[PDB]
């Protein structure tokens, strides 16, 4: 199995560049930078990390197609591809409606913007001169002057809907599902396969990626308490497909959403339960977080990206990941 | 007088942070990196710049409000200021319309968009949870997490026409003029002043930068053939008023345009002669470049930028400009 392992860039950069780095000596493959307006710049924070790291491949996780012009995001990847000596994924997925209301981003056609935006940042880092006349990219004439140094540079796509998971089966190179239980994955494997059916591909062209919320301890309850505020969170946003397939308590769902609109936040953490906690995190001792990872292997993931919180504390937990989780899921 | 140095990030990202180094070493105040979607991305090798060097200010130059959301550049510049320890500089401009419908970029309203960019970003920079209702620019509700070192960091314009000169007055920090010789000061300037009366604020609050083409070496004659291939390129984009503001041979000019069109070079490079050498390059010994900028310092320029060749070979220039030129022009 591969572990990630997936940071906002909301620190100083040094100290991101310090858990990658550990993260890296710890048997990490995957590192995951999140994209967004109101933090350091992905491309920069990666920049910094790669200089200081040597083999955990990076990427943003995710970008999207709006914030910048698709041709800017192929040539920072093949920035970073260059820099890194070869170890830059692309994760991109749709964004989301709340920044781009913020941003004045019409959030026009998701689906098929990010298959177009993924096929012409493909042609562009291919070295390729683009014309592409989409039904929303509309490339003409296009062409980097910056090689990246893979020959493919991975696309990975953020994919939570039906056509979305369909679509990454056609074209990604991974899918990155925002999910911690299997009973997600086994809904969701199905639609990639699908996808990938439609273009040929086999599914070991295509690594299914859980963006899970972890939290690892040697001591099980403070796991789970370094869980709750981020569970709060994802149960409050989840759609109600994923609640109804969690059999997740509706009731307390709405005292937490209602309490994340009050701006309060202990109200809305003491109505996170063991239910919640089991279907949107990956939580406690190594040997809870191994079996549970065990499980989504069993599914069809074939990457883990730990998520915060990581643990209660990130750099005790990314060593005791390394020393007791990645060595346990060695195929 | 304030020299400033700028590059293409086309080269491998060490490569140029050698020549900043190298420029920082020889008492360059300002690091000028263009950002165009073809080469390497302008942030990250800012990244990198920043950290191999300590004092030099360096920003882009210029960045547009168009292949990035402004709330992702205010971010960017939020992100370099804090690696850099405050050396953060936002050269910002139009970007150019062979750019934008390459990528399928409308390019509305040039003026307006720039002036209620550089307002937003302003804005995000302080700290502001932003509302901007502008003609173009529409904001609801960004903020940054990140934040600046620098209390306010500088705007520098890039500025050519009329309303864009009198926009940089009201509005910018620094006016980034693509123009060598002090005719097109003694007509650009005025301009700016209009803008800054417009608002109340003083010249002295504006770093008037000529964004120039430069090439010094110890031979006069080898700088000349190293300044002609760029001067080339500026002559056959220049507007017809800068051709007539310096006498340039009509004739001349479309031939070289004809030569660029046709893919083919030495024959452009052919027609290039001394007179449009004298308007759009400061070529030369070091003698002849200091009388050179002296003359624009003379005419209000408060800050010369080294733009390419910058010399024949340019680590030698860098030196030369270092040793010989920037010393000669302490006020």
Redesign the interface.
Known sequence: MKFGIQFVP?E??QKLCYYVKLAEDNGFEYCWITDH?????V??????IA?NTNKIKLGPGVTNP????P??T???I???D??SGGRAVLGIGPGDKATF?????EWVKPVTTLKESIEVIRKLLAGERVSYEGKV??????????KPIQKAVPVYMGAQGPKMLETAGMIADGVLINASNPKDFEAAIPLIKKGAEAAGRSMDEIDVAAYACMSVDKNADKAKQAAVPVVAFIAAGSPPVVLERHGIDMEKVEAIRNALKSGNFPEAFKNVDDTMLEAFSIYGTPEDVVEKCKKLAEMGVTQIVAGSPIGPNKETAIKLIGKKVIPALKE
């Open positions: 909301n100083p950069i307006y109101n933090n350091r710049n491309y920069m924070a990666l920049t910094a200089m709006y914030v910048r012009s041709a800017i192929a040539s920072a093949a920035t970073l260059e820099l209301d913020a941003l004045g981003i990219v509309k490339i003409a004439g296009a062409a980097l002057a910056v």
